[PDB]
Amino acid sequence: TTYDYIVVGGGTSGLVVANRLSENPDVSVLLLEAGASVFNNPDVTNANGYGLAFGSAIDWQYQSINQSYAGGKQQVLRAGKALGGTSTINGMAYTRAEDVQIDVWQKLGNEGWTWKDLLPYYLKSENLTAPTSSQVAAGAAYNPAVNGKEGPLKVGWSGSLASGNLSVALNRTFQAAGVPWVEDVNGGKMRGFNIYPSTLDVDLNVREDAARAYYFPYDDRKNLHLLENTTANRLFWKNEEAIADGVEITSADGKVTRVHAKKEVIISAGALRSPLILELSGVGNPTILKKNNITPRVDLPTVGENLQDQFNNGMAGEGYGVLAGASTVTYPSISDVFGNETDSIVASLRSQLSDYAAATVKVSNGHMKQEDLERLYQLQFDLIVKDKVPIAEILFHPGGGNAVSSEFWGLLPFARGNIHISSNDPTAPAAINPNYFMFEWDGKSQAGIAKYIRKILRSAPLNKLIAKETKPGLSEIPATAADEKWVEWLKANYRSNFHPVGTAAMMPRSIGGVVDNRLRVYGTSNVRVVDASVLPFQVCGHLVSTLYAVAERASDLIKEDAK
Numbered sequence: 001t002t003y004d005y006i007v008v009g010g011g012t013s014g015l016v017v018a019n020r021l022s023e024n025p026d027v028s029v030l031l032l033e034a035g036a037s038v039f040n041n042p043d044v045t046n047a048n049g050y051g052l053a054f055g056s057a058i059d060w061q062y063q064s065i066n067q068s069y070a071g072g073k074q075q076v077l078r079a080g081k082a083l084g085g086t087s088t089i090n091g092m093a094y095t096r097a098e099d100v101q102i103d104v105w106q107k108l109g110n111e112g113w114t115w116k117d118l119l120p121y122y123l124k125s126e127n128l129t130a131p132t133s134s135q136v137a138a139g140a141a142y143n144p145a146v147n148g149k150e151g152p153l154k155v156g157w158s159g160s161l162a163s164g165n166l167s168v169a170l171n172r173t174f175q176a177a178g179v180p181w182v183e184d185v186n187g188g189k190m191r192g193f194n195i196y197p198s199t200l201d202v203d204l205n206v207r208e209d210a211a212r213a214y215y216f217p218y219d220d221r222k223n224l225h226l227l228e229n230t231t232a233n234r235l236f237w238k239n240e241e242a243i244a245d246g247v248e249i250t251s252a253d254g255k256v257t258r259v260h261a262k263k264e265v266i267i268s269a270g271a272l273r274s275p276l277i278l279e280l281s282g283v284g285n286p287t288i289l290k291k292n293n294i295t296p297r298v299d300l301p302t303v304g305e306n307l308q309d310q311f312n313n314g315m316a317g318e319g320y321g322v323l324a325g326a327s328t329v330t331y332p333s334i335s336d337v338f339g340n341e342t343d344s345i346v347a348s349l350r351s352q353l354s355d356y357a358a359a360t361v362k363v364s365n366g367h368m369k370q371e372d373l374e375r376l377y378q379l380q381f382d383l384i385v386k387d388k389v390p391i392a393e394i395l396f397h398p399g400g401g402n403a404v405s406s407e408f409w410g411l412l413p414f415a416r417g418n419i420h421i422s423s424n425d426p427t428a429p430a431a432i433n434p435n436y437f438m439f440e441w442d443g444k445s446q447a448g449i450a451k452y453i454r455k456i457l458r459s460a461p462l463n464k465l466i467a468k469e470t471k472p473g474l475s476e477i478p479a480t481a482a483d484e485k486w487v488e489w490l491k492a493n494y495r496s497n498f499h500p501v502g503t504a505a506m507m508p509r510s511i512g513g514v515v516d517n518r519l520r521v522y523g524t525s526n527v528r529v530v531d532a533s534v535l536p537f538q539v540c541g542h543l544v545s546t547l548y549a550v551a552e553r554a555s556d557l558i559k560e561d562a563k
């Protein structure tokens with residue numbers, strides 16, 4: 001029951017760390033995973049199975065508090081309970097981030113974290129299957145210079161991919177609206193329309209989750225150990241800067257035991273669990289810890305703060321006939337969405353930034369300083385307004401038969417919330433509050449994006465295919481309706497976009513960070529967080545690509561520190 005490294009959470013990020021640290025045959029690694037294999041789970045393996053696993057035994061189905069700035073309801077925040085984590089239940093889209101938005105990580109004080117520092121690790125993680133000519137005819141494309149050829153994560157396009165009326169029409173309609181087709185959204189400039197690749201083993205025609213990528217091909221390594229169906233409760237400490245001695249675990253039979261780490265404990269339980277594990281271990285806000293019958297070990301009160309999530313809405317149209325083709329993504333900038341209204345939207349946002357920052361201070365009861373929040377919000381504002389990073393993701397796909405479905409989300413809302421333990425019982429549900437719709441921009445941008453989608457459906461040449469909008473439809477929201485009617489409908493119908501970051505944010509400790517630029521938790525010698533918790537801001541694209549790259553990079557930092 002002693003190992004060099006214990007990796008808590010056999011998920012998207014954790015499996016990368018366990019894979020890379022176990023490359024040294026003299027280093028022993030223990031993975032702790034609450035779930036089990038999903039190698040044979042048909043809701044997981046099906047390349048066309050997104051959504052099948054929702055609400056099943058492999059979905060944690062975490063519950064938020066009532067969202068008082070939105071519709072007042074509790075929202076589910078889905079997450080994978082499985083070897084492979086959330087990569088087993090996700091939408092399989094493989095898209096990255098805007099170069100300048102990774103560069104901001106260094107601007108905020110994280111030395112060595114820029115697009116060019118992370119780029120080799122995106123490449124290291126990936127093995128892209130080049131598209132066939134029929135896939136190229138459907139619009140599949142890539143830039144060879146920005147895609148890896150030999151990494152564990154297989155990426156590619158469906159063998160079923162075929163050009164069809166809907167995707168040809170969407171491409172032409174966006175181009176006419178001034179949004180160009182881009183060959184690859186993964187080279188650091190994401191704006192455009194694209195037939196995006198997926199985390200797919202194209203030869204096997206199965207979802208390429210993190211366990212199929214980083215675990216099963218390597219599972220006979222004698223130095224790589226898995227304890228599945230096993231829940232990590234908390235870390236325990238050597239008897240000053242805190243030195244983790246190991247992890248306390250509960251097995252399937254309910255027995256509580258200890259496993260010991262000789263070098264480090266890496267916490268990779270996801271953004272909605274890693275901060276809870278810290279809190280249960282005494283690392284966090286001492287007032288919250290003492291209220292919940294925990295003895296504080298490290299006074300780090302921003303654990304669980306700076307939670308940032310996006311929210312997703314859906315729209316739909318009906319064709320005159322059957323619609324087919326590629327699934328598309330569009331990443332429009334603020335001016336693509338707002339056109340002539342852009343300057344007005346920008347001025348309104350500019351005028352509110354300081355007030356947003358003031359309101360966010362209260363969320364943490366002042367454990368983030370107003371001045372630091374204003375600095376962070378100014379960086380996000382500049383990315384939106386000056387660098388013109390995409391403000392939305394819009395997916396369009398055939399919905400079956402004559403249906404076209406769109407799913408979309410604002411990428412850079414300003415609302416921050418938090419997650420905290422609700423007791424010292426490791427099984428108790430956390431208090432999770434993303435504060436969806438807290439700030440005017442967050443809903444106003446969402447409404448702008450929805451109106452833009454309505455306009456695209458009615459624009460040539462796509463309009464020749466589309467009989468009418470069906471969701472919301474013109475009866476529910478007439479085209480003469482004010483913006484507030486859009487915001488009301490979006491509030492009533494959104495879901496979490498399941499993209500939470502920031503709950504153990506990488507920032508300097510003086511401005512409220514939880515981990516340093518080597519992902520080590522402040523106040524500890526040998527504890528790291530390596531998962532979405534550490535991203536200090538949202539990214540424009542889909543999270544796994546960046547989380548794999550971050551975990552690949554962390555693995556090198558861990559190896560260096562061991563030498």
Ligand SMILES: Cc1cc2c(cc1C)N(C[C@H](O)[C@H](O)[C@H](O)COP(=O)(O)OP(=O)(O)OC[C@H]1O[C@@H](n3cnc4c(N)ncnc43)[C@H](O)[C@@H]1O)c1[nH]c(=O)[nH]c(=O)c1N2
Pocket residue numbers: 008009010011012013014032033034035078079080081082083084085086087089090091092093094095230231232233268269270271273497498499500530531532533542543544545547
């Ligand atoms: C429905 C849906 C749809 C999408 C997405 C998410 C969701 C929920 N995402 C987001 C992406 O899939 C997600 O952000 C990452 O998989 C999260 O990886 P992490 O390593 O942070 O946590 P992740 O959740 O993967 O891993 C945490 C692991 O820790 C385990 N665990 C938790 N608590 C534990 C404890 N106490 N003890 C032991 N084990 C514990 C969990 O069971 C899990 O295996 C996505 N991304 C993308 O790139 N493309 C997409 O198309 C989508 N779409």
